[PDB]
């Protein structure tokens, strides 16, 4: 058996306190041979290296970022939140002489109230349905936490046959973005006559229904 | 100098084939470093496959990727490549590699910006764009338009979309690119932007154009923008002429109902033939730009249904039913093929008759005129010579077999207005007639007057001996008016006109101006043989009274007497003779005897 | 309030037994007398008898006829009618003056009337003869 | 609340006689008019004929006709109070202008039975007469 | 197959550097034989560079070709090769290489299949094809449509020239690739392509594919098809409703000129208001597409005029004027130029009247037709319905003033089978007459036919006491036919009508289809005193002995009534005995007076 | 001065006679020390050596080809005219110690009888006017003969700017083909309509004018 790093899911903090992450191994404790490090995973492909080597520092790093070793996980003590704090970070230790890695653990700094978000669904066109394919866009937008996809549920009865949802990405204005795709069949799409798109944020239900003759 | 780095981007490496990449390093030592190479995958953590040391060596690799490592790291190169030989179907992920000081506090410094690498045994296909737009219409200058071209596979993860106007300008506000998804086969990814409607309707801008740079290949998306509607159509239905019927024989097919006031172009155009719908026989003109330049846009339709002649003369009412919004606009025609060339110059004005004037105590103008092809500008007004404005009576009689038409007008005016011969005067204002016409009635000049002679003449014997029926007449004679009312009377009871009838007043023989006139009142032999007492009335203007009657009946003897013979004394005076004469001659015959003796 | 009594054909120049229909048309409902009279003598009551005077009451029309009509019918016809209104206000009908017609041919009386004429001329010759005659011969007689 | 006088039912004339007409009333002075018609119900209205003259309202037809036979009724206003009178009727007759032969059939037939009578008894004393001539001569010549 | 020679395709190298070769050979012991080169130029015969010896040795080489080596085949594979240096102008040709057997007989047995080496100081740049269609209109099967794609300015690289319809498939045979020719520095070639109309129009194959193969690099081109040549245009012009002149219709009214089925492209429409030609106020729109399928059709244009409700009412008559190659189409609408009636060739049918019947013994069947043109091809004669001929004569008379003639058909038939009701039709026809008038008739209705009676009435006593005049009026009543002929008799002579007047025939009452009539003869009053014999006759159809007359004359008929006359006879008897009574008086006053006296 | 070997221009035969093709050297005679060659020039570019070494045979040469030296010409007595021999023979000695070659003859086997050429004229489309350019090409095939020259005449008058003639080539059914180019210029072709493709083939005049409004 190989060395598995379990690290945390998602984290929540405030400008104004302190977060801290833990690392906890699975062979066994984290002393000083372990060298700790913490990799930054930015949004825009953008790695940059913070604490590496528990008490080693580096250059470019400011001051309020802290390693330490309290009993044996590795402890990222981060003082204040940042706006630009908000990425995913790594467990990056030394076993087998080897580097292992991990899941990443996304962090999430609330700091902008949260707003209103946009649901606009795309139907598809005439030149689509040609090629007896069918595909309904539904973008998400104005939202800073991502909330999670909801069924496109169809006369009443949810679906099951191509259901997949995208990754989130941050976008301009401290915001981000997203969007969901239902590829469908051209033979329902002349039966079926409502398509809605249900969105979910933090129980406020958001859904924008259409009808077929609303169009031509 | 700032440290950078430089990595492949897109590489499209067969399975068949082994992928080899590079990882540039400048700015530093290059002879003072290690090399490491972290693999991430898009949804699971990052991997460690090997390092080498450039200067001296002693290094290893994975235990999970043991084999497959290569890293020709090349001193002067100062670049560290990786080649990764057979391929299989989990090795698509983004490779990067960074600096590790091991002399210094061993940690990283800079990173990559990405290596796309997809491991695929497809080939390379040209992605497929799609228009998406939205069916919500704008209500109000807060509901905005979203629309984008969906791009329905591409290799290489990084695709730009690029939006220009109806010219080359680039937008600048609007700076969206979605990832793409992984769907099993190639990618799927879209690019929405949000304008407003008041920078789309105010500019000439009629359609976007979505291109992707793929390869430097661009391709032009015209993605229309939808508009507004609100307003009415122009329905406009053509009738054939008389004489285009195509071929000697009545013969001809083709109408023009015409409408061009549509701005959504799918417009649903019908012929509804006497209610029923028309199956097949129609075209639909395509649709085409009526004018160019303007502001609003128009376009125009022409749709034409192909009939026959002997389905036009039977009064067949057609229907170019238009539906545009929702909304039926009909539009009814008159399948009426006659020429209308009988139009000729004469009106008459025709004072109205005795019976009438005397009934109503008010005299009815006429303004009678005839030939007339068309109607629809009849216009018949009444007044006086003084100009005062008088109410007429409009009423049109049936055509007649020529074609030609005819109307009175009817103005109630009292009877003494005639009496005092006034003036009255009729404008009519036609199409046929090159200028108004104005005439005048009024009384005629003095004549000599006459009232009637009525006369009742009963049946002759002759005519009761066949035991049919009888004639009762009435003779009126001696009259100057033609206008002239006789009627007759049963019981007091008025009959009516169908059992009996009155000639025509006829110039009276041997006296110019007289006229003279009968009446036979046909009874049956039934009624007549009970002593009915049968009359005629005579209504004319000339009687000292204006009426008069006349009766006879079974007596033909009643004349007036009162009471002067018939008495029973002359049956007295008659036996009292007989006694004389007996008397007489008895004394007669005894004076002769005593002369004897 | 009780003199809306109508009539019909009032001078009526009849012959001898003819027909006419009288009525006696009024807007009141009570006791009715039928009335007739001839020159200047009083009023008099009528009585029925079937076939020479019909009486047929259409409810508020009571109907009259009078068949066989001679001489001695010449007159004045109404109906009388009672209004027991607290004050006795009798009322009746305006009249209907029948006549009788002599059928002379209204040319036959001058024949007649110039051959009275000749006789009583006669008359007047004869009787002078007559009148002179027994003076005359009882002169001669007695000589 | 007035009455009037219904006047003849009937009325004679010789034809080119005048005809005058009559309208007897309470009244003091009312509005007075002349309705003629027709003997029975004609289809047209009633003819008014001119306003009469005379306090009475009496009508004048200096040269009467034949077509002026009818009803002649007389219309009586007295402060906005209508009342129907019965009406008249005119007629010609154009009776017998002989009257030298003692006028009156009774008399005429009376006097042709009476010469009846006397003529006889004036005829049957002469022959009394011529008898007791006859007896006497007889004597006379014995 | 077997081994053969394999030598480069095209090559293309920029003057300046030197050009590298190759010379497989394989099959045989290439340690051997010897190698030559043979430059063929384009135009001109060949040349010699020199030659190797691999086994001893000794390059020679050509006293013009001295100081170029080329040689040098030194390679593995026994590879032959050739490096030429300093590339001239005048060394584009193409070169060759051979096997030379210096022990056998030194003769030529294998050879290569060409190297084509252009030596250009040019680029790379991209060929462009251009369609070439022959302006041949195919007017029979035997004409073949031959078209073709060129191309221009492409580099000497092998090219090619395919045909690929609709359904990708390539041409088994047809495909002529002619060679390249050279003018300045720039080469060119055409490929033509013969097939027959036969195997087009029958197909979906509307326009042809030429690709190319530079560089394995495809581009497709439009070919297009002519149609015919000229065919014949129609004019066909509508004319507006009545109910088109309503409110918020735009512009009122508006003319199309409908002018399909036309094949050549320039076209002039205008309109004539009038005779005068509109400068402005209409609005031609673009030539579209009537009808979709194969190439050789027509088009479609449809016009627009603006017109107004004022200058509509002047009766105006537009003309839509088509140039069409010179020819003028003139059309008067809003006119009855064609399918108007008039008053054409009227045939009338008379039939036979009685009195030459009674007289004549015959009855005469007469067909007179008027408004006749033309009378030297008339052609009319009598028939029956089942088809039987009649003996026809034809009588003409003069000329109508206005000019038209006339004819009649003159027959003679038994008149028992015209009272049988036998239907008699009379066949006329003309040059005039697009189709033969043929009436049909027969014994009009025949009624109850009811004979006269008459009644003579007697004048009323009331006239007569006037002492001015009489009428004696004599009813004839209850006869079926119109005609009526009463005629008074004095004494036995006929009564002018100066004197007496009749009335018009007129239905009687109490029985449809029944007639009378009356009359009146006014005599004066000492005529009627003087008892003259008046009397009046009548003259019907219906008649038995064809003339009746009553009597009713003198002065007095008499008249039987009720006992009115019992006591005139009583009065007559009373005279009588008064008369008797006087003369007994008189006889024995007479007596008495003789026997005194 | 070099050897110039100066062979013929062009020899008719027919299958039943016998040609011979004759060889004239100008530095000297030619004996037996002149290795007489003799190259066949194929249409589809397939070189074959056939009497080669006076004498000397080669594998694959029918017997009917014979080479002899009369007086000091190269004759090549060929025992018969079939339809394969129809070509282009070269004449190779040895001169100066190098092989010395010339100009080819070319070869007309007169066998099946000749056609009716085919004449058709290709004017250009509006694509080649955009670039003020014009090309006219006059396809010319059905032809054993090949076609003697393209003569263009304008308007009664003929050109000489741009009046090349492309080689004849051998296509399939035992015939030739060939065509004409005539680059005009677009300004010419607004003005001129008379365009004509004179062909003469032995006497035939062959002539398909056309005008500029037959086209469009």
């Known amino acids: 058996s190989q060395a598995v790093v379990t690290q945390e899911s998602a984290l929540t903090t405030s400008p104004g306190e302190t977060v801290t992450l833990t690392c906890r191994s699975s062979?066994?404790?984290?002393?000083?041979?372990?060298?700790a490090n913490w990799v930054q995973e930015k949004p825009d492909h953008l790695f940059t290296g913070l604490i590496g080597?528990?008490?080693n520092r580096a250059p470019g790093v400011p001051a309020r970022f802290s390693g330490s070793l309290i009993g044996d996980k590795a402890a990222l003590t981060i003082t204040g939140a940042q706006t630009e704090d908000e990425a995913i970070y790594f467990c990056?230790?030394?076993?087998?002489?080897?580097?292992?890695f991990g899941g990443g653990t996304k962090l999430t700094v609330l700091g902008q109230p949260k707003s209103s978000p946009s649901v606009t669904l795309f139907p598809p066109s005439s030149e689509e349905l040609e090629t007896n394919k069918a595909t309904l866009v539904c973008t998400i937008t104005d939202f800073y936490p991502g909330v999670v996809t909801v069924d496109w549920k169809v006369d009443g009865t949810p679906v099951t046959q191509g259901m997949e949802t995208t990754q989130p990405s941050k976008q301009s204005n401290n915001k981000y973005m997203a969007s969901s795709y239902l590829t469908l069949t051209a033979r329902a799409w002349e039966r079926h006559s409502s398509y809605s798109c249900q969105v979910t944020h933090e129980g406020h239900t958001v859904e924008k229904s259409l009808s077929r003759a609303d169009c031509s | 100098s700032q440290v950078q780095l430089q990595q492949p981007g897109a590489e499209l490496v067969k399975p068949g084939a082994s992928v080899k990449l590079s990882c540039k390093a400048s700015?530093?030592?290059?002879?003072?470093?290690?090399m490491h190479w972290v693999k991430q995958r898009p949804g699971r953590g990052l991997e460690w496959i090997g390092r080498?040391?450039?200067?001296?060596?002693?290094?290893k690799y994975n235990e999970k990727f043991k084999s497959k490592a290569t890293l020709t790291v090349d001193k002067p190169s100062s670049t560290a490549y990786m080649q990764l030989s057979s391929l299989t179907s989990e090795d698509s992920a983004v490779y990067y590699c960074?600096?590790?000081?091991?002399?210094?506090?061993?940690?990283?410094?800079?990173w990559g910006q990405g290596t796309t690498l997809t491991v695929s045994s497809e080939s390379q296909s040209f992605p497929n764009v799609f228009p998406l737009v939205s069916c919500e219409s704008p209500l109000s200058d807060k509901n905005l338009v979203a629309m984008g071209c969906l791009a329905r596979d591409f290799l290489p993860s990084t695709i730009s979309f690029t939006w220009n106007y109806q010219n080359n300008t680039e937008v600048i506000q609007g700076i969206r690119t979605f990832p793409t998804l992984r769907t099993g086969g190639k990618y799927l990814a879209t690019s929405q932007v949000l304008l407003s409607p008041k920078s789309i309707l105010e500019g000439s801008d009629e359609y976007l154009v979505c291109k992707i740079h793929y390869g430097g290949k661009n391709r032009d998306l015209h993605v229309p923008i939808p508009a507004v509607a609100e307003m009415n159509p122009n329905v406009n239905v053509f009738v054939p002429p008389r004489d285009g019927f195509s071929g000697p024989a009545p013969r001809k097919s083709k109408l023009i109902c015409e409408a061009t006031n549509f701005t959504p172009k799918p417009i649903t155009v019908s012929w509804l033939k006497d209610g029923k719908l028309v199956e097949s026989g129609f075209t639909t003109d395509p649709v085409t730009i009526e004018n160019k330049g303007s502001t609003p846009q128009t376009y125009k339709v022409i749709s034409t249904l192909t009939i026959s002649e002997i389905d036009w003369l039977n009064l067949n009412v057609y229907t170019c039913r238009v539906d545009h919004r929702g909304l039926t606009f009909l539009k009814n025609v008159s399948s009426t093929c006659a020429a209308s060339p009988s139009t000729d110059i004469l009106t008459f004005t025709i004072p109205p008759s005795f019976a009438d004037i005397f009934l109503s105590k008010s005299a009815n103008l006429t303004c009678l005129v005839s030939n007339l092809a068309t109607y629809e500008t009849l216009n018949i007004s009444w007044a006086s010579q003084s100009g005062e404005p008088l109410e007429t009576k409009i009423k049109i009689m049936e055509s007649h077999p020529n074609g030609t038409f005819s109307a009175k007008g009817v103005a109630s005016v009292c009877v003494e207005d005639w009496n005092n011969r006034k003036e009255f005067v009729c404008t009519v204002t036609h199409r046929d007639l090159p200028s108004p016409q104005k005439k005048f009635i009024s009384k005629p000049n003095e004549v000599h007057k006459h009232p009637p002679a009525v006369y009742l003449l009963p049946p002759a014997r002759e005519q009761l001996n066949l035991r049919e029926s009888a004639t009762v007449t009435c003779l009126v004679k001696g009259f100057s008016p033609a206008d002239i009312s006789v009627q007759w009377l049963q019981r007091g009871q008025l009959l009516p006109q169908e059992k009996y009838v009155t000639s025509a007043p006829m110039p009276e023989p041997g006296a110019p101006g007289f006229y003279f006139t009968h009446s036979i009142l046909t009874v049956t032999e039934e009624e007549w043989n009970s002593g009915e007492t049968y009359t005629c009335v005579v209504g004319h203007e000339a009687l000292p009274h204006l009426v008069t009657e006349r009766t006879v009946d079974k007596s033909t003897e009643g004349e007036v007497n009162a009471e002067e013979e018939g008495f029973e004394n002359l049956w007295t005076t008659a036996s009292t003779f007989i006694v004389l004469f007996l008397l007489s001659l008895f004394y007669s015959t005894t004076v002769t005897l005593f002369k004897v003796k | 309030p009780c003199s809306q009594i109508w009539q019909h054909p009032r001078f009526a120049a009849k012959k001898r037994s003819s027909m006419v229909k009288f009525h006696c048309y009024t807007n009141h409902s009570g006791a009715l007398t039928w009335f007739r009279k001839r020159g200047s003598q009083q009023p008099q009551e009528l009585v029925s008898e079937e076939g020479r005077i019909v009486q047929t009451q259409n409810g508020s029309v009571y109907t009259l006829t009078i068949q066989n009509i001679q001489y001695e019918d010449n007159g004045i016809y109404f109906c009388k009618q009672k209004c027991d209104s607290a004050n006795h206000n009798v009322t009746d009908s305006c009249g209907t003056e029948l006549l009788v017609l002599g059928f002379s041919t209204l040319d036959q009386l001058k024949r007649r009337n110039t051959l009275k004429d000749g006789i009583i001329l006669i008359q007047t010759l004869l009787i002078i003869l007559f009148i002179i005659v027994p003076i005359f011969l009882l002169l001669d007689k007695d000589d | 609340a007035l009455r009037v006088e219904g006047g003849p039912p009937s009325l004679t004339v010789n034809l080119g006689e005048e005809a005058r007409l009559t309208c007897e009333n309470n009244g003091r002075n009312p509005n007075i008019t002349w309705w003629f018609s027709l003997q029975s119900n004609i289809t047209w209205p009633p003819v008014p004929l001119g306003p009469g003259q005379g306090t009475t309202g009496q009508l004048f037809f200096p040269e009467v006709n034949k077509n002026h036979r009818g009803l002649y009724w007389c219309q009586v206003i007295e402060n906005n109070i209508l009342k129907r009178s019965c009406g008249t009727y005119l007629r010609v007759r154009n009776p017998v202008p002989r009257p030298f032969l003692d006028m009156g059939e009774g008399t005429k037939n009376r006097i042709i039975t009476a010469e009846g009578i006397i003529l006889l008894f004036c005829a049957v004393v002469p022959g009394t007469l011529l008898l007791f001539r006859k007896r006497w001569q007889n004597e006379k010549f014995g | 197959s077997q081994v053969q020679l394999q030598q480069p395709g095209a090559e293309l190298v920029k003057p300046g550097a030197s050009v590298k070769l190759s010379c497989?050979?394989?099959?045989?012991?290439?340690?051997?034989?010897?190698?030559?080169?043979v430059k063929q130029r384009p135009g001109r015969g060949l040349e010699w560079?020199?030659?190797?010896?691999?086994?001893?040795?000794?390059?020679?080489?050509?006293e013009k070709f001295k100081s170029k080596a080329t040689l040098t085949v030194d390679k593995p594979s026994s590879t032959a090769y050739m490096q030429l240096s300093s590339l001239t102008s005048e060394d584009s040709a193409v070169?060759?290489?051979?096997?030379?057997?210096?022990?056998?007989?030194?003769?030529?047995?294998?050879?290569?299949?060409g190297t084509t080496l252009t030596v250009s100081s040019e680029s790379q740049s991209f060929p462009n094809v251009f369609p070439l269609v022959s302006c041949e209109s195919p007017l029979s099967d035997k004409n073949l449509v031959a078209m073709g794609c060129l191309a221009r300015d492409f580099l000497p690289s092998t090219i090619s020239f395919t045909w690929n319809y609709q359904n990708n498939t390539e041409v088994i045979q047809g495909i002529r690739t002619f060679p390249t020719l050279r003018t300045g520095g720039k080469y060119l070639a055409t490929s033509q392509v013969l097939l027959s109309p036969k195997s087009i129009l029958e197909g979906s194959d509307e326009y042809l594919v030429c690709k190319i193969h530079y560089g394995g690099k495809n581009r497709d081109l439009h070919v297009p098809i002519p149609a015919v040549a000229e065919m014949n245009p129609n004019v066909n012009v509508f004319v507006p409703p009545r109910d088109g002149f309503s409110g918020p219709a735009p512009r009122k009214s508006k003319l199309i000129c409908e002018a399909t089925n036309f094949t050549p492209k320039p076209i002039t429409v205008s309109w004539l208001k009038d005779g005068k030609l509109v400068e402005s106020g209409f609005t031609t729109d673009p030539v579209t597409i009537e009808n979709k399928g194969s190439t050789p059709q027509t088009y479609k244009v449809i016009s627009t005029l603006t017109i107004s409700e004022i200058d509509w009412l002047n009766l105006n008559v537009y003309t839509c004027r088509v140039d069409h190659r010179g020819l003028t189409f003139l059309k008067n609408v809003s006119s009855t130029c064609a399918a108007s009636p008039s008053t054409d060739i009227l045939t009338f049918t008379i039939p036979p009247s009685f009195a030459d019947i009674f007289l004549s013994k015959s009855a005469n069947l007469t067909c007179l037709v008027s408004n006749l043109a033309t009378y030297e091809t008339l052609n009319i004669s009598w028939a029956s319905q089942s088809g039987e001929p009649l003996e026809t004569k034809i009588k003409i008379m003069e000329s109508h003033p206005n000019g038209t003639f006339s004819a009649k058909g003159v027959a003679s038939v038994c008149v028992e089978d015209w009272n049988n009701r036998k239907e008699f039709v009379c066949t006329v026809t003309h040059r005039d007459l697009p189709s033969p008038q043929k009436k049909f008739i027969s014994k009009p209705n025949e009624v109850h036919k009811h004979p006269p009676a008459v009644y003579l009435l007697p004048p009323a006593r009331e006239q007569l006491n006037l002492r001015e005049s009489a009428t004696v009026t004599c009813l004839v009543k209850g006869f079926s036919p119109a005609d009526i002929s009463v005629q008074w008799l004095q004494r036995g002579q006929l009564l002018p009508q100066e004197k007496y007047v009749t009335s018009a025939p007129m239905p009687e009452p109490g029985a449809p289809g029944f007639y009378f009539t009356h009359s009146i003869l006014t005599v004066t009053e000492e005529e009627w005193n003087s008892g003259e014999t008046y009397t009046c006759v009548v003259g019907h159809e219906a008649l038995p002995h064809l003339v009746t007359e009553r009597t009713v004359d003198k002065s007095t008929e008499g008249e039987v009534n009720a006992e009115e006359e019992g006591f005139e006879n009583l009065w007559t008897t009373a005279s009588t005995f008064i008369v008797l009574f006087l003369l007994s008086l008189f006889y024995s006053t007479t007596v008495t007076l003789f026997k005194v006296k | 001065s070099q050897a110039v070997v100066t062979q013929e221009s062009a020899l008719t035969t027919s299958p039943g006679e016998t040609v011979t093709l004759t060889c004239?050297?100008?530095?000297?005679?030619?004996?037996?020390?002149?290795?007489?060659?003799?190259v066949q020039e194929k249409p589809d570019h397939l070189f074959t050596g056939?009497?080669?070494?006076?004498?000397?045979?080669?594998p694959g040469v029918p017997a009917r080809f014979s080479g002899s030296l009369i007086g000091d010409k190269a004759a090549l007595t060929i025992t018969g005219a079939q339809t394969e021999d129809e070509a282009i023979?070269?004449?190779?000695?040895?001169?100066?110690?190098?092989?010395?070659?010339?100009?080819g003859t070319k070869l007309t086997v007169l066998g099946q009888p000749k056609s009716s050429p085919s004449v058709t004229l290709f004017p250009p489309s509006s694509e080649e006017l955009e670039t003020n350019k014009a090309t006219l090409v006059c396809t010319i095939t059905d032809f054993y003969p090949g076609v003697v020259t393209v003569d263009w005449k304008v308007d009664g008058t003929p050109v000489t700017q741009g009046m090349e003639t492309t080689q004849p080539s051998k296509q399939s059914n035992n015939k030739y083909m060939a065509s004409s180019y005539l680059t005009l210029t677009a300004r010419a072709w607004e003005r001129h309509s008379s365009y004509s493709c004179q062909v003469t083939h032995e006497g035939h005049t062959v002539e398909k004018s056309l005008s500029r409004a037959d086209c469009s």
């Open positions: 700015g530093y030592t290059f002879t003072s470093y290690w």
């Open positions: 080498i040391d450039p200067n001296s060596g002693g290094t």
């Open positions: 080597g528990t008490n």
């Open positions: 062979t066994g404790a984290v002393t000083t041979s372990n060298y």
């Open positions: 990056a230790l030394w076993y087998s002489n080897h580097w292992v």
């Open positions: 960074a600096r590790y000081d091991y002399y210094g506090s061993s940690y990283f410094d800079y």
